[PDB]
Amino acid sequence: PGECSVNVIPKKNLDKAKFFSGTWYETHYLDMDPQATEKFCFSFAPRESGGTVKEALYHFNVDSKVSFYNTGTGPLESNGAKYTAKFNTVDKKGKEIKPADEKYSYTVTVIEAAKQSALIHICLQEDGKDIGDLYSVLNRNKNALPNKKIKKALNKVSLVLTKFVVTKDLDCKYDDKFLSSWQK
Ligand code: HEM
């Protein structure tokens, strides 16, 4: 049903200080549920310290024109490129408007990172069981195409980039200040 993908391999020796800094924009995404067809834009600001990831998340539903903000927190695995987070809901000012529900979590794997590009996978869970997953190509620049190493990573697991939704064509609205001000 909502079974998460196998063969999701964390990058060996990810540079933590570089990846867990600044703002990342999703440029392409592939939701593994073919009926998940509402268009979205996504950006986030992940940070790490002492083996714990603390990240600010921004989603924008293009269909409904509604944005939502979250923060996620959880332990980084010993491989340094995978983490499982609990999350709450905040407003644009960072104030909590809905508390975390302990039964929900997500697991992010950083599959590849090169230059100003990255490829991540996220598995959403409820009570530790898979409910859905998605792959996303990230870039420091909203309108940029991915480094070839990201396509190589996709091809290693029989995915091709043309199958992904491209958001540069979408009418995205971003809250960049929410992310730039994260932990300031
Ligand atoms: C990159 C492309 C992404 C897309 C297109 C996307 C899309 C979505 C969609 C459709 C939902 C459900 C919204 C709803 O129920 O109305 C959602 C929820 C959520 N996503 Fe994503 N997502 C992306 C990336 C991520 C990433 C990378 C993370 C974590 C690092 C993440 C964390 C979450 C969380 C925590 C929720 C639940 C929010 C809540 O219940 O308040 N998403 N996303």
Curated annotation (Swiss-Prot):
Histamine binds at residues 31, 133. SUPFAM superfamilies: Lipocalins (SSF50814). GO terms for cellular component: extracellular region. The keyword Heme applies. Its EC number is 1.7.6.1. Its cofactor is heme b. It is an enzyme of class 1 (oxidoreductase). Expressed in the endothelial cells of the salivary glands. Heme binds at residues 59, 70. Binds 1 heme b (iron(II)-protoporphyrin IX) group per subunit. It holds the Pfam family Nitrophorin. One of its GO terms (molecular function) is histamine binding. GO terms for biological process: modulation of process of another organism; vasodilation; venom-mediated perturbation of biological process. It is found in: Secreted. It comes from the Eukaryota. Keywords: Disulfide bond, Heme, Hemostasis impairing toxin, Iron, Metal-binding, Oxidoreductase, Platelet aggregation inhibiting toxin, Secreted, Signal, Toxin, Vasoactive, Vasodilator. Forms oligomers (at pH 5.5). Belongs to the calycin superfamily. Nitrophorin family. This is Nitrophorin-7. It comes from Rhodnius prolixus (Triatomid bug). The lineage of its organism: Eukaryota, Metazoa, Ecdysozoa, Arthropoda, Hexapoda.
